[PDB]
């Protein structure tokens, strides 16, 4: 009843949530690594590794992993973020151990064949060319680069083409050696799962993983806090039909006391699409203004990103490159943040937001996979798992006042960074934005 936890002698944490009336489950290994653990010439390795982990291990050739997984009807997947590397599997309860076995095998005993490493450089490039076609993706990568100027969080996950062509098997093995420590990973599972047995299998297949010499609890500070840098980057692209803008301010980290309050505020501003509306029965003054007299943009989306020691909070805008004066939609957005700062918000919209927030964080924890996602990410970036009931509590206690306070702290006399891609001529300055916001 709740989430069971155990720690292996090498530092590895095993976190579990049993789900009654199930015969299948999800198990995943979460490693506090990701691109924020790389350096400038290193940049892109963790992702490169993820690709190779599926090419063969010291115990199983590539096609061997595939066929074995497909024969027991399991599923195997992985992903890399700026904060971590995750490998996970979905399978019938009978195969949980087989699953743990294979996960550890792919993570730590991967071959990394030189032929494989060279063929893969092309795939990764191809992948890079695809991200370049997703304007939102592009804008947010640039935003991270200037906001976290010359810092780990400022680098992308894929890395520069330059690095994709230069990463060497040595780079790969070093990254593994440096980062893969028991005290830096979590084996999370949910579904038809026995915690005690899973801890055993953990020891059996992951026990061989090295402890860091200077262990630190998963939650403890990586080191010097990332620092938010105000800045702007205009990327002129007259050929683009739509223009994309992202405006941010230093946000909140995963463990921040005001974490949920920040999400609550994001939800009060919400989103809007020129065609669909808000997806709310009652639109905000901002949404109404956006849609009036011809529309001021195609869409806007409030966003919030969190990391263990930092966060970004802001707006993402999409405008018609030939029809919209970006200045006008930016003004309305700043007007809306000021509305919140001046307390001019209703009980009803505050309640609407808390309800939106609770559903988004809780009703979405439906299958074992989503639950493993939550267990894993929380423990690996925070050191603990707030339970669904605890999160409910955190959201439910938020007051109109909490929000007004938070906005007045984070959106008044604080730096902002911005990125614009497309028809830049109509986009306002970062000093323009702070002037109007603090005004």
């Amino acid at each position: 009843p709740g989430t069971r936890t155990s720690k292996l002698p090498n530092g590895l944490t095993i976190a579990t949530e049993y789900i009654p009336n199930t015969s299948s489950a999800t198990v995943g290994i979460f490693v506090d690594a990701g691109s924020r653990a790389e350096n400038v010439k290193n940049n892109g390795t963790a992702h490169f590794l993820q690709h190779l982990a599926f090419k063969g291990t010291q115990n199983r050739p590539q096609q061997g992993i595939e066929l074995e997984i497909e024969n027991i009807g399991s599923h195997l997947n992985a992903y890399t973020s700026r904060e971590n590397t995750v490998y996970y599997a979905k399978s019938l309860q009978e195969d949980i151990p087989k699953a743990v076995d294979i996960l550890s095998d792919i993570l730590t005993k991967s071959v990394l064949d030189n032929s494989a490493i060279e063929r893969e450089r092309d795939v990764i490039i191809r992948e890079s060319e695809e991200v370049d076609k997703m304007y939102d993706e592009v804008v947010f990568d640039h935003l991270h680069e200037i906001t976290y100027k010359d810092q780990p969080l400022g680098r992308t996950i894929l890395g520069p083409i330059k690095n994709i062509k230069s990463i060497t098997r040595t780079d790969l093995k070093d990254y593994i050696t440096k980062n893969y420590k028991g005290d830096r990973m979590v084996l999370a599972g949910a579904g038809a799962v026995d915690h005690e047995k899973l801890v055993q299998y953990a020891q059996k297949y992951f026990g061989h993983v090295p402890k860091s010499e200077s262990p630190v609890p998963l939650g403890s500070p990586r080191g010097p806090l990332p620092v938010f840098c105000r800045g702007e980057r205009f990327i002129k692209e007259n050929t683009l039909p739509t223009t994309h803008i992202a405006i941010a301010l230093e946000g909140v980290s995963w463990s921040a006391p005001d974490y949920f309050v920040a999400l609550a505020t994001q939800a009060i501003v919400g989103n809007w699409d020129r065609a669909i509306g808000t997806g709310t029965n009652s639109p905000s003054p901002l949404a109404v203004a956006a849609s009036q007299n011809g529309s001021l943009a195609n869409s806007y989306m409030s966003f919030s990103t969190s990391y263990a020691d930092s966060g970004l909070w802001g707006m993402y805008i999409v405008t018609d490159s030939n029809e919209h004066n970006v200045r006008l939609i930016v003004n309305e957005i700043l007007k809306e943040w000021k509305r919140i700062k001046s307390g001019k918000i209703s009980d009803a919209e505050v309640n609407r937001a808390k309800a939106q927030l609770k559903a988004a964080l809780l009703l979405s924890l439906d299958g074992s996979t989503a639950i493993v996602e939550d267990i894993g990410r929380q423990v690996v970036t925070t050191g603990k798992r707030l339970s669904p009931e605890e999160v409910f509590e955190q959201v439910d206690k938020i007051t109109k006042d909490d929000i007004i306070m938070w906005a007045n702290y984070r959106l008044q006399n604080k730096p902002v960074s911005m990125v614009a891609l497309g028809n830049t001529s109509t986009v306002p300055n970062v000093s323009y934005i702070e002037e109007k916001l603090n005004q």
Partner: peptide, 13 residues
């Protein structure tokens, strides 16, 4: 999309 949160991630999708 429709309403919330948004971090970056690459997947062997």
């Amino acid at each position: 999309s429709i309403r919330f949160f948004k971090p970056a991630t690459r997947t062997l999708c």
